Chains A and B, each alone.
Chain A
Amino acid sequence: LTQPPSASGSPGQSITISCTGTSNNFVSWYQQHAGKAPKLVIYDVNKRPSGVPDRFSGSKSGNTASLTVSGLQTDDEAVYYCGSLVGNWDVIFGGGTKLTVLGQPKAAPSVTLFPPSSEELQANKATLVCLISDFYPGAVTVAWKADSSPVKAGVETTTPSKQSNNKYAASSYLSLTPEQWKSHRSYSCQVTHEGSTVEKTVAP
């Protein structure tokens, strides 16, 4: 199931998150607070469970399923997963949608790229780290390139985390061989935030 990576809204506004790949009505959505267990906020599409506010509503149109949260509040900040029965008895889950009700204001990310050190190359290892921080929303994709052609190997990216200033931050780790590092002069790191991208490049 395909769930949007991120979602944002101000308190009182209404957010509608979608899900696709559901041919049946068994669609259900879950809410998981960070450092806690997931909780089912909806089941059998629109139907609500016990102790769940009316503002949560499930909907499915065609092959697309949708959840709607109106009247946003602090406690609505979490990761939202969707799931449904498929075929005979197997069940699958989406990637989940991260909805944040954190405080203002929006901001462009900040990238600082560090090439491998002299002591690191001695271990016959080469690692480049992109440091991205101070961005809103808290979901950002990172891409790597060598000279021109993109680099699809050695990419380790982790989920961003909120800072003391309430701005999110993330770091991507690229581990390769020293041979391809010295051969290729420049290594580019592309960081995509809300359509607009921020790039950095380093050469020995």
Chain B
Amino acid sequence: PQLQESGPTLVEASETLSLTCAVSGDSTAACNSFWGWVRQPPGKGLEWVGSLSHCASYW
């Protein structure tokens, strides 16, 4: 299982930051775990961003 991040390392202010993760060794279809992001500002603590999953329920 390997997670490879990809996208622009340099973005201008007020613009739209876009990033894409490429998973290897596992399926995003799997309902065992959620997939999302966690960003760590330079010399600072860990902050939760968000996660989602297509594995749904009846509603």
Contact = CB atoms under 8 A, between A and B. Distances in A.
Indicate if A touches B (C-beta under 8 A): yes
Interface of A: 30, 32, 38, 81, 83, 90-96, 158-159
A83 B46 contact: yes
A91 B43 contact: no
Contact of B46 (A30, A90, A159): A30
B48 A38 contact: no
B48 A91 contact: yes
Interface string B19-56: 00000000000000000000010010111100000000
Contacts of B45: 81, 93-96
20 contacts: A30-B46, A32-B46, A38-B40, A38-B46, A81-B45, A81-B46, A83-B46, A90-B48, A91-B48, A92-B48, A93-B45, A93-B46, A93-B47, A93-B48, A94-B45, A95-B45, A96-B45, A96-B46, A158-B43, A159-B43
Interface of B: 40, 43, 45-48
A84 to B, nearest CB: 11
Given A38-B46, A91-B48, 15 more contacts: A30-B46, A32-B46, A38-B40, A81-B45, A81-B46, A83-B46, A92-B48, A93-B45, A93-B46, A93-B48, A94-B45, A95-B45, A96-B45, A96-B46, A158-B43
A49 B46 CA distance: 20
A14 B46 CA distance: 25
Contacts of B48: 90-93
Contacts of B40: 38
Contacts of A83: 46
Nearest to B44: A159
A90 B48 CA distance: 8
A158 B43 CA distance: 8
B35 to A, nearest CB: 14
Contacts of A159: 43
B33 to A, nearest CB: 12
A82 to B, nearest CB: 10
A90 to B, nearest CB: 7
